[PDB]
């Protein structure tokens, strides 16, 4: 087991696999009952002495484009090279692996923007060892502010007790802030259903397919969250210390509920394409009815205007009581009988 | 034997007998020429082109002691690649894709490889192969192929084939990133057909490369005694390259599938637009056609003649009928 070999790359190099290369920041929280210390360091040396520190520490590394920092931390903290590759590898599915010394966790974040129904994916990775939590994230802006302010306020049992509660706090915050985005998407789809029932315009297909792809990505993310929480809860690895088995069982139930919700909502979404097809088919039927009636009334009338509009040397014109109004009345009668037939058949 | 190869034109046999000191090239067509070269202790390379000549490949196979089922599997051309393990020899079959410009199709060539002792054997459907780089390396005394055994040569052949897979993927990438904008911005009559051929090529590549990944994984994990232990990391590297290729193929297929389903969903709106155009134009120009046809009449007595400005008046009323028919629409936004 060692770094995978890539054709384009040189044999040993590790490459970032993302789009965000704008910002670099490190946040280190050494929180404890007696006191806590917070500080931001632009360099990687300051986090190294906390490898074997007894007090729990929480290192937030923002900006993984700097592969130098990540593999320096990995060499210093004993992280295996393949775990480093998967930390850099954003294009990934959430998963966890158990080692002799550390627990590696992969699970993604999603953000949503108004007026643009785009679902992002931020690769945030967690490393649990000794009493340290190592976090690698793509860009500034996180979902863990409530846990940070809870630590700063000293409220909650997470500050008093061990760091496995810190890992649980991070994971619970991530699963919780899935729900802000989920609520936003549910409101968006409800209002969108409102317009599609009101106005079935051209953009509806594009928006519905965008939402369908969004749901596909959410399913491809949520389904790996089980077999992750599954391993954490059932497998009870030694680093858990068995104190937090219900704090993993509840998240198991939460993830199962989310997976069931996405399974239901996929069919809910497909029904929207079904409804749109219904509406467009009905509109096409209306257009057919209008065109058919117009042609049906006005073609025999063109028969009259052509047959009697012929020019011939000996035509039986036979003017009877100035029969030109008589022919006009004949056309009127045939038009009336045709429109009556259409009304009876209920095309119009 | 049962034969299903497409081509019959060419047939040629090539043999490479090279050692750490000297190398020799031989060009011939007789079957018995390669028979003495099998006994050579140094690793040897056999290139046989033309599967339609069943008799010569047969005589070679029974000379080498190859089981007839392997021979008939080689005769089979339309099968998924798969690797066989036997005590006397290891059996491998692969694929050889070729891509072309100005016309977008996939051409696959069946190739099979059998490795026994210090002997390397393969059968080619036509002349020309992707294995030019390894031949050039051997001819000009480069690399470390000569120092190692024949299993390293088998490695070299496989990695040359995966290199040509990468070369194919680059052209596929160009085509997909041009069709992306072609579908999104400027649809055409044949854009749909281009998307279908692209998806066909991609699904064929996926169904071909998954067996290749399985074959390389089996070679790496099983580590058969015939292939030396020291050459297993190279096979693992080729397996990783195949993983790369598979991931690329899956991403490309997803992109093409999205390009398909968006367009396939827009077709109902397309139909509505076309028939709206037809209906509006027909319903505006049929009543006017009748008005002109019936007022342009050839009965003897015309009340139209007596009316002053009759022709301008009928033209004006025809225009206002056209106007009211136009404004009949836009109430449902038909126009």
């Amino acid at each position, epitope marked *: 087991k060692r770094l995978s070999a*890539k*054709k*384009g*790359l*040189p*044999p*040993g*190099t590790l*490459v*970032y*696999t*993302g*789009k965000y*290369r*704008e910002d670099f920041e490190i946040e280190v929280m050494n929180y404890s009952i007696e006191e806590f210390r917070e500080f931001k360091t632009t360099d990687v040396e300051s986090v190294l002495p906390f490898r074997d520190s007894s007090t729990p520490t929480w290192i937030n590394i923002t900006g993984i*484009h700097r*592969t*130098d920092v990540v*593999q*320096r931390v990995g060499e210093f903290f004993g992280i295996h090279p393949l775990v480093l590759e998967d930390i850099l590898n954003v*294009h990934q599915r959430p998963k966890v692996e158990f080692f002799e010394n550390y627990v590696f966790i992969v699970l993604k974040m999603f953000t949503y923007d108004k007026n643009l129904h785009e679902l992002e994916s931020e690769q945030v990775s967690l490393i649990l060892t000794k009493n340290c939590v190592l976090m690698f994230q793509e860009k500034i802006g996180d979902v863990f502010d409530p846990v940070r302010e809870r630590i700063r306020y000293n409220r909650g049992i997470i500050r008093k007790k061990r760091a496995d509660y810190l890992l649980y706090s991070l994971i619970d915050a991530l699963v919780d802030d899935y729900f802000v985005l989920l609520e936003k998407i549910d409101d968006e789809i409800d209002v969108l259903e409102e317009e599609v029932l009101e106005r079935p315009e051209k953009e509806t297909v594009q928006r519905t397919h965008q939402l369908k792809r969004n749901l596909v990505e959410l399913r491809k993310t949520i389904w790996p969250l089980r077999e992750v929480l599954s391993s954490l809860y059932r497998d009870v690895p030694p680093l858990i210390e068995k104190e937090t088995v219900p704090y993993f069982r509840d998240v198991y139930d939460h993830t199962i509920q989310i997976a069931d919700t996405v399974e239901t909502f996929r069919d809910i979404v497909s029904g929207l394409l079904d409804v749109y097809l219904s509406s467009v088919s009905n509109k096409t039927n209306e257009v057919m009815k209008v065109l058919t009636i117009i042609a049906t009334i006005f073609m025999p009338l063109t028969f009259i205007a052509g047959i009697y509009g012929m020019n011939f040397e000996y035509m039986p014109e036979l003017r009877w009581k100035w029969g030109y109004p008589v022919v006009l009345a004949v056309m009127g009668v045939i038009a009336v009988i045709m429109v009556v037939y259409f009304k009876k058949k209920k095309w119009l | 034997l049962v034969y299903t190869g497409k081509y019959r034109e060419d047939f040629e046999i090539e043999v490479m007998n090279y050692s750490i000191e000297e190398f020799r090239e031989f060009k011939t067509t007789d079957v018995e020429s390669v028979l003495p070269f099998r006994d050579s202790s140094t690793p040897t390379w056999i290139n046989i082109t033309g599967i339609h000549r069943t008799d010569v490949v047969q005589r070679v196979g029974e000379f080498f002691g190859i089981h007839p089922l392997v021979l008939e599997d080689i005769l089979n051309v339309h099968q998924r690649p798969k690797v066989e393990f036997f005590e006397n020899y290891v059996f491998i079959v692969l694929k050889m894709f070729t891509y072309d410009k100005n016309l977008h199709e996939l051409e696959s060539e069946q190739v099979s490889l059998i490795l026994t002792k210090n002997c390397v054997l393969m059968f080619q459907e036509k002349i020309g192969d992707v294995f030019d780089p390894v031949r050039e390396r051997i001819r000009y005394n480069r690399g470390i192929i000569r120092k190692k055994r024949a299993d390293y040569l088998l490695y070299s052949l496989i990695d040359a084939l995966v290199d040509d897979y*990468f070369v194919l*993927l*680059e*052209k596929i*990438d*160009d*085509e997909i*990133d*041009v069709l992306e*904008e072609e579908v999104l911005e400027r649809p055409e009559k044949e854009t749909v057909q281009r998307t279908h051929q692209l998806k066909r090529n991609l699904v064929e590549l996926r169904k071909t490369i998954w067996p290749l990944r399985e074959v390389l994984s089996s070679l790496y994990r099983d580590v058969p005694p015939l292939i030396e232990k020291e050459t297993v990391p190279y096979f693992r590297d080729v397996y990783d390259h195949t993983i*790369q*290729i598979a*991931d*690329t193929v899956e*991403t490309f297929r997803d992109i093409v599938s999205g390009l398909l389903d968006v367009y396939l969903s827009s077709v109902s709106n397309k139909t509505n637009e076309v028939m709206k155009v037809l209906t509006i134009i027909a319903t505006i120009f049929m009543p006017l056609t009748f008005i002109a046809g019936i007022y342009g009449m050839n009965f003897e007595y015309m009340p139209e003649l007596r009316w002053k400005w009759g022709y301008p008046v009928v033209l004006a009323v025809m225009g206002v009928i056209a106007v009211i028919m136009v404004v009949y629409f836009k109430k449902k936004k038909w126009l």
Partner: antibody
Amino acid sequence: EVQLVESGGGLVQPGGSLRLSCAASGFNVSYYSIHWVRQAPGKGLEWVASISSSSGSTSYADSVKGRFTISADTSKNTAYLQMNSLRAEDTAVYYCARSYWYYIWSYSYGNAMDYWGQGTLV
Amino acid sequence: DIQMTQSPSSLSASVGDRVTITCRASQSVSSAVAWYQQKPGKAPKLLIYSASSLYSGVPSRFSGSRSGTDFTLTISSLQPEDFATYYCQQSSSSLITFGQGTKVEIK
């Protein structure tokens, strides 16, 4: 903070040899790739060599293949280009570059020279 | 050896005029195309990498795109700082080659 400095360039008699150098400050050579780009006066940039001290892999331009040797040492955090069998066509203003790989597809990667040197003329 | 042919050889425009610099690849380079600016007597600076991504710190007015093997570096509106030589670089292989260059000078 980051600075990439190259030195050792100067006047050379044609047919001779000249040993270039490159010193890196703020970043470690072991975690990146070091290139060399030369620009003859009034001409376009021409890539000549590339080195990765982590593995020692070397890439050489076919225009100048064999006339150049490139390597780096982790002790002094430096890289250098050694010149052999020089001629008139080798005259240019050589550059030291730092490049990082980026991901575009699972099969293909790319290179981008985001930090360069100040420039030395040979 | 993927030689890159860059057009136009020479061009001139005034401040505020949108321009485009097109690069052509003889062979297929997937998206490994980068753009640099070289002021007279200065080190080149990375602007666009992967043919579509702007390097950090570059003004957002610069933009590049890919059309198959057609790579175009377009400027929303030239500035006094933007009258220089721009280069097209392919990074598909270990052997990496530059373009000829487009020289921009004030009208």
